[PDB]
Design a protein around this ligand. Sequence first.
Ligand SMILES: Nc1nc2c(ncn2[C@@H]2O[C@H](COP(=O)(O)CP(=O)(O)OP(=O)(O)O)[C@@H](O)[C@H]2O)c(=O)[nH]1
Ligand SMILES: Nc1nc2c(ncn2[C@@H]2O[C@H](COP(=O)(O)OP(=O)(O)OP(=O)(O)O)[C@@H](O)[C@H]2O)c(=O)[nH]1
Ligand SMILES: [Mg+2]
Ligand SMILES: [Mg+2]
Lengths: 426, 310, 428
Amino acid sequence: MREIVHIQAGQCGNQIGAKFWEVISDEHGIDPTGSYHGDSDLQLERINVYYNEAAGNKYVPRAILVDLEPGTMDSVRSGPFGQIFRPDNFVFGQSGAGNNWAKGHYTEGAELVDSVLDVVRKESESCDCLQGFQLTHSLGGGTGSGMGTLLISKIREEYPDRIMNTFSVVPSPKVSDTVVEPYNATLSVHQLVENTDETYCIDNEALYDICFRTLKLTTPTYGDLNHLVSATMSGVTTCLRFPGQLNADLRKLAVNMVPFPRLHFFMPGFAPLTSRGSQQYRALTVPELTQQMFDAKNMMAACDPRHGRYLTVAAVFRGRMSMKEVDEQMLNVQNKNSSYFVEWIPNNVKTAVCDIPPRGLKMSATFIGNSTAIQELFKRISEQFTAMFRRKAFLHWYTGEGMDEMEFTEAESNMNDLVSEYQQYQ
Amino acid sequence: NIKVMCRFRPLNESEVNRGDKYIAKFQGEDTVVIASKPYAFDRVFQSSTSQEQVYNDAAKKIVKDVLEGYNGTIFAYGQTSSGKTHTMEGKLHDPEGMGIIPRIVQDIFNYIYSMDENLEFHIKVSYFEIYLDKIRDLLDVSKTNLSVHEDKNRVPYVKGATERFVSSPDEVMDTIDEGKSNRHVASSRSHSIFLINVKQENTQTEQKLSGKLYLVDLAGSEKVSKTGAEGAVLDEAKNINKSLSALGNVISALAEGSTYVPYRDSKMTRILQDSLGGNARTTIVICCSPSSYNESETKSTLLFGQRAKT
Amino acid sequence: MRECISIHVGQAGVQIGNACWELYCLEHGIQPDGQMPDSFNTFFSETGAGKHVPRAVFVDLEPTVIDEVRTGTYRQLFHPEQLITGKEDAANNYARGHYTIGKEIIDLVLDRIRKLADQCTGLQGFLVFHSFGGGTGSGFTSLLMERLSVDYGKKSKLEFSIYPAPQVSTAVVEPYNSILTTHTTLEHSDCAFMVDNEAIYDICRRNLDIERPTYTNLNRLISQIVSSITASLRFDGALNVDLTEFQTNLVPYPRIHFPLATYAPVISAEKAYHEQLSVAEITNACFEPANQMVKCDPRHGKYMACCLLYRGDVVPKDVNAAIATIKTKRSIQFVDWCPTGFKVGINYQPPTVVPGGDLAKVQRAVCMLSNTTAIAEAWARLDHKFDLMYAKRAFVHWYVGEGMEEGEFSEAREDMAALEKDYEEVGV
Ligand SMILES: Nc1nc2c(ncn2[C@@H]2O[C@H](COP(=O)(O)CP(=O)(O)OP(=O)(O)O)[C@@H](O)[C@H]2O)c(=O)[nH]1
Ligand SMILES: Nc1nc2c(ncn2[C@@H]2O[C@H](COP(=O)(O)OP(=O)(O)OP(=O)(O)O)[C@@H](O)[C@H]2O)c(=O)[nH]1
Ligand SMILES: [Mg+2]
Ligand SMILES: [Mg+2]
């Protein structure tokens, strides 16, 4: 019940969702062969929400994989927990978007999306009653952003009455991996604002700094970043998969953090994050996790929360806690930082708790803040967009493939109005 | 600025035998009292006042301003058997007590025939609905999922609207009837927007002026917990109530002098992003049956007017 | 002959039901599997030979809390029909749990309550547990109270509802749902016992000496309260107090039926030996502002009526002596138009103690239910929160998108204002 299908597009989205299936399978005791070898029955109590039962008690994901290059498919098949996936859900082209939103939203994406759409129809009819979807993509390139945007548009045309998720990795300005990040990012945000229901604005430089300083690791590879994102993703939907003393599924988090339909871009976070040496010099307790997640230097979005106000903040704890301690510490944080937390929304905190923590820790937590610092992100990108749009740089690629300048102008206008939204509630 | 002007229709013989009471109390000339509580307005037009004074007080200044290049807008609203069809069109050809829309159209065509010969007053008209959040088109059976786009001057508009020229009131009436033939009605279950675009072209000065004027026939806010609806009607009620509360929030943001106005939360407020903001008059006309049998729903209607001023 | 059905809505209601039915199965001596190795009829039926099924109906839309009971230790006591389960939760939304999702489930629970009331013969009243914050416990309970009042109407419908606190609160959108369901809390219910969580936190911190109390202890305490209410039905005391007599002596006017409760003595085992818990001490402790179930100082309010449901080793003489001491104290001030605002109740059965529980084994006990005006203060600050939510229209479009309207918000706020006005009028 309340099943979820995990759409997963782009190279970065493929890697992130692969690590997500890794961490979620480690918690359900699912071997590389898709077979169960766990201990507690609470694992299999809600296996059907993500996975699906097949011949021989083999549980397979309800996950669609999407790309315009078969190299990522080769990687996911050859990498660990590749055989768990269903081969029919592999939907790959051959062109490659090449950081061109137009190619991955008009020409190649429009021709390829029929297969993905039929496949998600099949996966949505096989269940009993789903609740919401999950798109895992990136706003930098054209494959992920464009394909996921076209796809989620078609979905909201088909299923407008289901909660929707987008676990986006926005491109930071300092970590410049490509040149046309502002174009693709803004052109995708023009559609994520009006189609999605809740978006998590993960950021690259954020996770880099978290792995440099909070964990004190010397060589942060993409595996570690993806593991952080995977812990974040699994921490959110633990209420569906397991019991608890106060449950909170996706729709509850949405309706307890989305005051208006457009103010649904959230910065996530995770705790407790500890290094190797400092793992002993750290007492796992609710005040510790609390003051560790609200720290600006434990955030997965490159936007200082101190520079803005919090509107809504959902803390989804995981462990056999005492609810009095939880509510007391969250109240004390709301009191100590009354200037940051907004005033016309009393009880800015939403809380959720479960009993089964991740495999390895005694307790854990998860953080979803709807701060107003997000505007800074949509400020910085916008500047870059103008700097690239004033002189019409790199535009003939988008123009020759089917776009027009007016769509760029509309995306900029909508994004500026979103910045104004986040400004006025400060 | 915005100005709400409420109307209470006369009672009909169908419920005089029913034994209903006239439970609509008045104070001054701009405040009603219902259920021993006052609801304020700007004008509260009564059962006795005919269409002429209501028209002269509500729609005259709008047409006077839009002919000078500005933009105007009108919001009709009401439940079933509330006086919408009587107030907006009512009589078709009778110049005595006919509705508002024919009077606007005839005033446009009577102003155009009083000007100089060097002014080509082009008159475009569009007529499109908003159903289940989809912008259908009532002048075309194929264009069922239209969308909104902007222009260089940040003036939204439907891309692909089946525009149609006109040169007389009868053509306008025929177009309105042809559009209403396809309107989703069980009882209106869909917002309708009739746009009138008056492009006046001055040849001596070489300046053009396009005045846009919206006739919005809203749908009915329906507490579905009472009605017991199931199926598509439920989703229709959901989307209708969403659009209505979004419009209310927008109008409250306007009249409260807020620095920002969230026009982009609903398509019906996206299309109207220009005609309400600044130099654009607007008048909201709500029709109500003051009978006690329709008291409960009437409260909601009055409250929809109260989310205009305060 | 007597009987009383118990409805349990939301995660709060279901977990309170777990705790309560644990208490019930323990008091009557009944094993978890129903087998009993007269008095149980007030809450338990009898499935022929060697079985006792309860007079309960667990309703909820989150399948997790109900499946926790279908697999829990009490999987054998209940049978799968009383354990109703939806598919998609209300998700902290009044409207979803009121009409959108509620219509899929309510026919079945109403059919079950018809099958469960036609089994008994002397039904005394219902018991509806729900939190004002959640979507299910507000909307579905409003709908259910409406349907029952249309069907039964006359039967004493009670609801021992959790109430969100002003500071210690878990969800963002609780004031909305609370104000929305106060309408049905007024018109259809008969006497509701509001309960706050932070009060129980403070009681567990001070007396029981637990620094880290979770919801299980709260639920055990509330179960003790309900057992104190219903021991006048279950067992036979020297001075019985039925629910109709209870309501008559406690509910003067038809709208003033929200008495806040309080239970005593609540103390740990190590603290029990030092304190001689006589009748006078436990009777005096209940009137203290610190031992109440809701955040409100009674010293700024005036009691109109209150019932003292003593149970255990009690004799009326020291009861009347302690009552005289209370009536002489000036800080505990009563309203003028009620010279005798006490309805004493004695019962022979002492309160039990659950294995693994935080309470101690005592011989005397009290459950005072003071009908006061000081509770209105909570509503005031609640309304304050609602105002801060309402003027800016936070989270409105979610409820609007499921059928709800602005007019319902306005009407509910007006009605709560009129209710506070009524309490403020009857005070003088
Ligand atoms: N947080 C992470 N970012 C990654 C990871 N792998 C790649 N990337 C980053 O994602 C950004 C580009 O996304 P992709 O590699 O998926 C290129 P995309 O699929 O969007 O379309 P094409 O350019 O046509 O290949 C870029 O900033 C990468 O540095 C990862 O594992 N984690
Ligand atoms: N005293 C006590 N309070 C509880 C308990 N469980 C939940 N509460 C409170 O219940 C409130 C939230 O309401 P819920 O019951 O969880 O929500 P719901 O009724 O299930 O409706 P949905 O969330 O939409 O599924 C919160 O204020 C909790 O603190 C409990 O076991 N004991
Ligand atoms: Mg790519
Ligand atoms: Mg719930």
